[PDB]
Design an enzyme around this catalytic site. Structure first.
Site, short mmCIF file in Angstrom:
data_model
loop_
_atom_site.label_atom_id
_atom_site.label_comp_id
_atom_site.label_asym_id
_atom_site.label_seq_id
_atom_site.Cartn_x
_atom_site.Cartn_y
_atom_site.Cartn_z
N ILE A 140 -8.26 0.60 10.25
CA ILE A 140 -9.29 1.51 10.39
C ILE A 140 -10.46 0.71 9.28
O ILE A 140 -9.92 0.19 8.42
CB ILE A 140 -8.78 2.95 9.52
CG1 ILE A 140 -7.98 2.70 8.24
CG2 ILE A 140 -7.99 3.54 10.46
CD1 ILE A 140 -7.73 3.75 7.51
N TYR A 187 -9.37 8.07 10.75
CA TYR A 187 -9.14 8.60 12.19
C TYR A 187 -9.74 9.46 12.67
O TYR A 187 -9.42 9.92 13.73
CB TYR A 187 -7.56 8.98 11.94
CG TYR A 187 -6.64 8.10 11.69
CD1 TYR A 187 -6.35 7.13 12.40
CD2 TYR A 187 -6.03 7.68 10.44
CE1 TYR A 187 -5.35 5.94 12.23
CE2 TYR A 187 -5.36 6.62 10.06
CZ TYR A 187 -5.10 5.78 10.86
OH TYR A 187 -4.16 4.84 10.58
N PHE A 213 -5.67 5.53 -0.27
CA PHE A 213 -4.66 4.49 -0.45
C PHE A 213 -4.72 3.69 -1.53
O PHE A 213 -5.62 3.41 -2.16
CB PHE A 213 -4.86 3.44 0.78
CG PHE A 213 -4.58 3.78 2.30
CD1 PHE A 213 -5.48 4.72 2.98
CD2 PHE A 213 -3.27 3.70 2.80
CE1 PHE A 213 -5.40 5.07 4.32
CE2 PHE A 213 -3.11 3.98 4.14
CZ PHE A 213 -4.02 4.93 4.89
N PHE A 236 2.20 9.88 3.15
CA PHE A 236 2.65 9.54 4.40
C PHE A 236 3.37 8.31 4.75
O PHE A 236 3.82 8.15 6.04
CB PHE A 236 1.58 10.23 5.63
CG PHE A 236 0.25 9.57 5.53
CD1 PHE A 236 0.18 8.02 5.81
CD2 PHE A 236 -0.81 10.07 4.60
CE1 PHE A 236 -1.08 7.45 5.79
CE2 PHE A 236 -2.09 9.15 4.58
CZ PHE A 236 -1.97 7.73 5.18
N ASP A 237 2.95 7.12 4.12
CA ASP A 237 3.57 5.98 4.45
C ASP A 237 3.34 5.04 3.13
O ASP A 237 2.51 5.16 2.42
CB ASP A 237 2.96 5.45 5.68
CG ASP A 237 3.79 4.20 6.12
OD1 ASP A 237 5.05 4.27 6.20
OD2 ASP A 237 3.37 3.16 6.38
N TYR A 251 0.67 -1.21 0.11
CA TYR A 251 -0.01 -0.02 -0.10
C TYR A 251 0.99 1.16 -0.13
O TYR A 251 2.11 1.28 0.52
CB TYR A 251 -0.97 0.15 1.08
CG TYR A 251 -0.14 0.37 2.51
CD1 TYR A 251 0.30 -0.64 3.28
CD2 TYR A 251 -0.11 1.68 2.94
CE1 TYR A 251 0.94 -0.47 4.36
CE2 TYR A 251 0.20 1.82 4.12
CZ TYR A 251 0.83 0.87 4.84
OH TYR A 251 1.68 1.14 6.13
C1 LIG Z 1 8.35 -0.88 10.07
C2 LIG Z 1 7.32 -0.92 10.95
C3 LIG Z 1 7.04 0.44 11.76
C4 LIG Z 1 6.29 -0.01 12.94
N1 LIG Z 1 5.00 -0.75 12.82
C5 LIG Z 1 3.71 -0.45 13.42
O1 LIG Z 1 3.78 0.40 14.18
C6 LIG Z 1 2.33 -1.40 13.27
O2 LIG Z 1 1.21 -0.10 12.81
C7 LIG Z 1 -0.12 -0.48 12.65
C8 LIG Z 1 -0.17 -1.90 12.08
C9 LIG Z 1 -1.59 -2.41 11.80
C10 LIG Z 1 -2.42 -1.40 11.53
C11 LIG Z 1 -2.44 -0.11 11.91
C12 LIG Z 1 -1.00 0.33 12.31
C13 LIG Z 1 -3.32 1.00 11.86
C14 LIG Z 1 -3.32 2.10 12.97
C15 LIG Z 1 -3.72 1.69 14.31
C16 LIG Z 1 -5.37 1.43 14.30
C17 LIG Z 1 -5.58 -0.08 14.21
C18 LIG Z 1 -7.05 -0.13 14.07
C19 LIG Z 1 -8.08 0.90 14.43
O3 LIG Z 1 -9.72 0.58 14.27
C20 LIG Z 1 -10.13 -0.85 14.78
C21 LIG Z 1 -7.67 2.42 14.37
O4 LIG Z 1 -8.71 3.23 14.42
C22 LIG Z 1 -8.03 4.73 14.65
C23 LIG Z 1 -6.30 2.48 14.43
O5 LIG Z 1 -3.32 1.63 10.64
C24 LIG Z 1 -4.26 1.48 9.60
O6 LIG Z 1 -5.52 0.86 10.02
C25 LIG Z 1 -4.09 2.22 8.25
C26 LIG Z 1 -4.37 0.84 7.15
C27 LIG Z 1 -3.24 -0.30 7.32
C28 LIG Z 1 -2.03 0.30 6.95
C29 LIG Z 1 -1.46 1.22 7.74
N2 LIG Z 1 -2.63 2.39 8.01
C30 LIG Z 1 -2.30 3.62 8.10
O7 LIG Z 1 -3.21 4.78 8.34
C31 LIG Z 1 -0.57 4.27 8.08
O8 LIG Z 1 -0.19 4.19 6.95
C32 LIG Z 1 0.23 4.58 9.27
C33 LIG Z 1 -0.48 3.94 10.40
C34 LIG Z 1 0.11 6.13 9.40
C35 LIG Z 1 1.50 4.07 8.96
O9 LIG Z 1 1.55 2.66 9.02
C36 LIG Z 1 2.83 1.91 9.00
O10 LIG Z 1 3.81 2.56 8.97
C37 LIG Z 1 2.66 0.32 9.14
C38 LIG Z 1 1.37 -0.32 9.31
N3 LIG Z 1 3.56 -0.18 10.39
C39 LIG Z 1 4.30 -1.51 10.14
O11 LIG Z 1 4.10 -2.21 9.29
C40 LIG Z 1 4.77 -1.91 11.72
C41 LIG Z 1 6.46 -2.20 11.21
#
Ligand code: A1AZI
Length: 109
Positions: free
Chosen positions: A58, A84, A101, A38-39, A28
């Site tokens: 999310i 968010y 995304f 942003f990522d 993604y």
């Molecule tokens: C090397 C690494 C850095 C550290 N590391 C993490 O810190 C893991 O971080 C997440 C993992 C899974 C899902 C989450 C965030 C969730 C955030 C938490 C959450 C869970 C559920 C919610 O409801 C029920 C919600 O409601 C508010 C919130 O992210 C999401 O769902 C969406 C859709 C999936 C892709 C990421 N997403 C985004 O928005 C983004 O791109 C972010 C988070 C700005 C940046 O992502 C990243 O760097 C990825 C993931 N990191 C990693 O791969 C690992 C390995």
């Protein structure tokens, strides 16, 4: 009904759609609606995994990626309602942000 809009970039197999309990393996790239990235899992050269049905992502992903078949590349436009909301994501995404995304569904596990 408009929390997430899914626009197809390239099609999948048209038959294999993810179900609750299954793990989606994706690449993604996330950006704000302006276009600022942003990522991206592509920047880490390692696919992202999440299991449906677990509140792991999310809501716009939970419903959006479930509309995709294996192989499909799609653009997901997600309202803050389905992302968010008023809080944002700490130090990354501001309140009331619309997200976009680019998602490629690679396989199911
Ligand atoms: C090397 C690494 C850095 C550290 N590391 C993490 O810190 C893991 O971080 C997440 C993992 C899974 C899902 C989450 C965030 C969730 C955030 C938490 C959450 C869970 C559920 C919610 O409801 C029920 C919600 O409601 C508010 C919130 O992210 C999401 O769902 C969406 C859709 C999936 C892709 C990421 N997403 C985004 O928005 C983004 O791109 C972010 C988070 C700005 C940046 O992502 C990243 O760097 C990825 C993931 N990191 C990693 O791969 C690992 C390995």
């Amino acid at each position: 009904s408009m929390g997430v809009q899914v626009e197809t970039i390239s099609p999948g197999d048209g038959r294999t759609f993810p179900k609750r309990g299954q793990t989606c393996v994706v690449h993604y790239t996330g950006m704000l609606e302006d276009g600022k990235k942003f990522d991206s899992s592509r920047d880490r050269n390692k696919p992202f995994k999440f299991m449906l049905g677990k509140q792991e992502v999310i809501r716009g992903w939970e419903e959006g990626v479930a509309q995709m078949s294996v192989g499909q590349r799609a653009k997901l436009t997600i309202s803050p309602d389905y992302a968010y909301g008023a809080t944002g994501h700490p130090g990354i995404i501001p309140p009331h942000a619309t997200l976009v995304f680019d998602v490629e569904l690679l396989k199911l596990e």
